[model samples]
Target chain A: HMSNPLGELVKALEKLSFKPSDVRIYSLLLERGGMRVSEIARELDLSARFVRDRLKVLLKRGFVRREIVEKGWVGYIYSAEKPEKVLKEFKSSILGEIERIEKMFTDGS
Target chain B: SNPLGELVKALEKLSFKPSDVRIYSLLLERGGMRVSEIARELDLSARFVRDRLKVLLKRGFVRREIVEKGWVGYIYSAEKPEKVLKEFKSSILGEIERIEKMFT
Candidate 1:
């Protein structure tokens, strides 16, 4: 499979401190568009339990998001934000916090 | 007791491993301590603390002073948190540029 680019992106994310499993899930969505938990687990050869846990971390990071695709007890699909957009927001968040903290440093003394 | 909760939580988003966050927070608030002392306080192995310190020191996030020794060897402290934050920002920017290059 010519899935090497996907692998490259995963490694880049690893440099950012993401675990392979969590970044892999994000990569899959970025490549394949929205997918349900079962669909993702089946393709990744991961258990529903483990994939679910990683997805929760991904969600908390805003790397992926979920929406209802049906009405079963589990009828949601997860979508990854475009890589550029994620990077943009990430840059903004860190710089914003840094600047805010800078003012606090000045205010203290 | 939990003065660093907010800052540590934010650092976790930027790729900080949980253990890294714990180690940094300890040094950040407590100023300086030795490997053995940190190990005891954090319930981690001295070897483990040393390993993390190696990276933190390398990245300029942490600093150390050579000590002849008593209970432990060298004393370690965090660099200014602002400096550490700026370093992390630059790291993230580098990753972004690298990943973008992959596409084109």
Candidate 2:
């Protein structure tokens, strides 16, 4: 477990301001490749309700992707995006805020 | 970044270490200080402050003037908070990107 890359990735994601519960779910997805909401909740020993809420934030942030189908078990499959892609997804969110701040400086807004 | 609180968030957002933020925050608040002076103000050891200063210096968060090491002091100051808001963010973007390359 010590050599598992999940811990390193989790620590790196924490640097970007993820909440503890969010990282718990996110890193689990990265670890298990993908999981259902109940599976994720049970695996991490978290409440299914809270896990769903955290998944919403991760979905909005584009750190996690969701897909649905009959093969999706009528619910959905949640998977963490590749670690390389997450770096950019994380970058643009902050850059968007910087744009707001920088424009505030330049255009006198 | 305004309202004084998010100033901490802005530095913190960059994943700056605790020591780094203090030195960065101190320099921004006061504009100028020596290592011992910062240690006195923040209740940290002079040598420990120097370690964080080295990080901020390389990362471009803190800039220093060579006022003479050990005689009077080297004056260290943080960039304008506005500049830090941009400086550290853009700088870390590349670092994160670089870290991802190791994923393979």
Candidate 3:
């Protein structure tokens, strides 16, 4: 997950328990720079509330960030911080847990 | 037919309908099996299994081989394996181009 120079970013996302819808929305915003919540909802045929909720979760998780536009309106943009480091940490932790479990099971003394 | 054309047409003859393609690909991956067995393996219906086998047999892409418990099972294999492999790789590359263009 350290963003292997040779690894596919999309495949890494796929392995993270993210739904296709989440991946699609994130990638769309990532490639398109930024979008308003209503724009994303309309474009993806999802409810505004649902889009807002998903964006909020992503925001809380630091996967995206929100900013104020003109007239006090808000816009959402994908985080430029590549999840590579975070993804690497998560993967390593899961692998470490698995190794611990294996030791516990095998140490049947 | 031109050499490539012959290969393409022969491969085309072995082509499966979308649903059948899913079924046959799963069957091919799992090796030989029966209707119920294929259904269980693929999360498909038994009717789908029988229907796909009929189509596959029509194209010589599958054959019936005996198995245990007097169960008549089937095996699916590529008739022109090399030709199909080349086409498969070519199509995969084509698909990536389309995905990139869509994103663009």
Candidate 4:
């Protein structure tokens, strides 16, 4: 695991351009596993609508997730997915070669 | 390359705790700028500076953008190796949900 999952999360968040509060809500889901939107709003002391709005952004970006949870409970939960493996594959495929070339040129002298 | 999908996966890692993500993503795309500049650019208040910086600095998502003048501003870049591109695509599903709801 990364030294700080949250730190890794921060990097991811930066890529998305989401607000901190919105990020926090997403973080809560990760740490706590999953939760309903109302529960999340209560925990964060935000309005349901406000939480829902943030969720919309996160959902739009695929950061937050929704699940049936339990029967008759149609609320949503949030979570973060680790991108390490895919990142490694992607880097190796393209960025890896570029990095090697760039390094070689920079150190050629 | 599914850029937006990549974007969503990147964001999922961030999850929550606002300032850090805002700061990091701002830097990533826009390159480095200063605290006040970031705040202005993002339409946030100065008061949020310390907290946002605290998280980003700790997380290493933020680096000081070099400036010849007063103080160096910040620039953010992606640091994670990839693993979840498809999850980000899920966000589009949410948009579909909203769209469907519009008819309801």
- Number of the top DockQ candidate: 2
Strongest candidate by TM-score: 2
Docking class of 3: incorrect
Q: TM-scores for all candidates?
A: 0.52, 0.68, 0.36, 0.34
iRMS per model in Å: 16.8, 15.7, 18.2, 13.9
Candidates 2 and 4 compared by lDDT, better number: 2
- Candidate 2 structure, TM-score to reference: 0.68
Candidate 4 per-residue C-alpha lDDT over B1-104 given as tens digits, one digit per residue, 9 for 90 to 100: 22224434544543557555555566655665667777788788866864676555554544444455665544434333221122222433344334334334
Pairwise TM-score winner, candidates 1 and 4: 1
Indicate the residue-level lDDT of A19 in model 4.
69
Off by more than 4 A, model 4: A1-15, A72-75, A83-109, B1-104
Question: Model 1 Cα RMSD, Å?
Answer: 12.1
Report every candidate's CA lDDT.
0.66, 0.66, 0.50, 0.51
Model 4 misses residue A21 by how many Å? 0.7
lDDT at residue A1 of model 4 (Cα atoms): 20
Number of backbone collisions per candidate: 0, 0, 0, 26
Scored against the true structure, residue A34 in model 2 reaches a CA lDDT of 77
> Can you rank all candidates by TM-score, best first?
2, 1, 3, 4
Error of 2 at A84 (Å): 4.0
Better of 1 and 3 by TM-score: 1
Clash pairs, candidate 3, are none
